[PDB]
Design a protein around this ligand. Structure first.
Ligand SMILES: Cn1ncc(C(=O)NCc2ccc(C(=O)N[C@@H](CCC3CCCCC3)C(=O)N[C@@H]3CCCN(S(C)(=O)=O)C3)cc2)c1N
Length: 329
């Protein structure tokens, strides 16, 4: 049967939630709460006008579909989703419930042993193997999107500078992108954990690209062969004029296996960049890698992503997913 809701106002926002969630306190529109059913603290996010427009309705549908799919130790999961509405005609608000994250990767680092770096990057790559197997690309991996508890256990999420961790093919608007845009980001994150400083702290995207190119070098012939336009080929050479740095110097003091792995992640040609599944088998993770416990995802139906639908259609699809939700064990 339908739970009893109670109404509350917080930070000028109306909150209507099942009575099981008590002691809401604001932390978007997100409250920490106490889940009386289980005894643990949770986070409750109220989406902001989810069906005000076509783009909002589709983004609401997308986030719910993605959250309902994620069943992996290193990826955020959905504990609950609800609406106060009793029917589709009344359906206007959507609430998502997740675990409460006490700290992100930045909070944790405010210096890690090489063992901590191994374990943190291992977990990111394990979560990425999972989401990438479902043809899901994060596209905005960065320390503030990584929840880490005091036990160094890590989950990937997207709260929604990105620039510093972004793959060069995106900032250059090159033709083909693949899932290894996320691997570039992992390389940038791992570098920072090892050195304590941002690897490519660009002031703008052009500055960013210049710093990238002086470390990883101007494109080689194999990469240049795949770039269609003369002006793009000339431009990337315009940006590769700073005196060249070398990995060995930049990462002095790091585990040599870590530097080898970084050289395989920070590759300009995304056809040659190491994948998440390949990276898990790198010697740097020898103490953690287990091929029997690095699972892939169930098939994920992305057919909706290409659709141009009306607001009421996206809303009805979202309502369907709210109603069909099954809590995890
Ligand atoms: C202190 N603390 N502790 C917990 C919380 C909290 O807030 N808990 C609620 C919450 C948190 C994160 C998410 C989340 O990660 N939403 C992912 C799910 C998909 C991704 C796919 C790649 C792997 C990670 C999960 C996603 O789709 N995020 C998009 C990012 C930008 C685009 N939007 S949009 C669809 O346009 O609106 C959203 C959702 C709800 C908090 N503050």
């Amino acid at each position: 049967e339908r739970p009893t809701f109670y109404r509350q106002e917080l930070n000028k926002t109306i909150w209507e939630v099942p009575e099981r969630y008590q002691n809401l306190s604001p932390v978007g529109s997100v409250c920490a709460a106490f889940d009386t059913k289980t005894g643990h603290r949770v986070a409750v996010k109220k989406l902001s006008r989810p069906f005000q427009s076509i783009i909002h309705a589709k983004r609401t549908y997308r986030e719910l579909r993605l959250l309902k799919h994620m069943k992996h130790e290193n990826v955020i999961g959905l504990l609950d989703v609800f609406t106060p509405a009793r029917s589709l005609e009344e359906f206007n608000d959507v609430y998502l419930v997740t675990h409460l994250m006490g700290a992100d990767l930045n909070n944790i680092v405010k210096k890690l042993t090489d063992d901590h770096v191994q374990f943190l990057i291992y977990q990111i790559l394990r979560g990425l193997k999972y989401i990438h197997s479902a043809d899901i690309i994060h596209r905005d991996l960065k320390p503030s999107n990584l929840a880490v508890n005091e036990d160094c256990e890590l989950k990937i999420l997207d709260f929604g500078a990105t620039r510093w961790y972004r793959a060069p093919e995106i900032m250059l608007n090159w033709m083909h992108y693949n899932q290894t845009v996320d691997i570039w980001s992992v390389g940038c994150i791992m570098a920072e954990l090892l050195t304590g400083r941002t690897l490519f702290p660009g002031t703008d995207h052009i500055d960013q690209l210049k710093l990238i190119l002086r470390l990883v070098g101007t494109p080689g012939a194999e990469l240049l062969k795949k770039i269609s336009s003369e002006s793009a080929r000339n431009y990337i050479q315009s940006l590769a004029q700073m005196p060249k740095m070398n990995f060995a110097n930049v990462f002095i003091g790091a585990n040599p296996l870590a530097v080898d792995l970084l050289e395989k992640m920070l590759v300009l040609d995304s056809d040659k960049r190491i994948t998440a599944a390949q990276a898990l088998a790198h010697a740097y993770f020898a103490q953690y890698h287990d091929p029997d416990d690095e699972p892939v995802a169930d098939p994920y139906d992305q057919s909706f992503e290409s659709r141009d639908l009306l607001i009421d259609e996206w809303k009805s699809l979202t309502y369907d997913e709210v109603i069909s939700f099954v809590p995890p064990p």
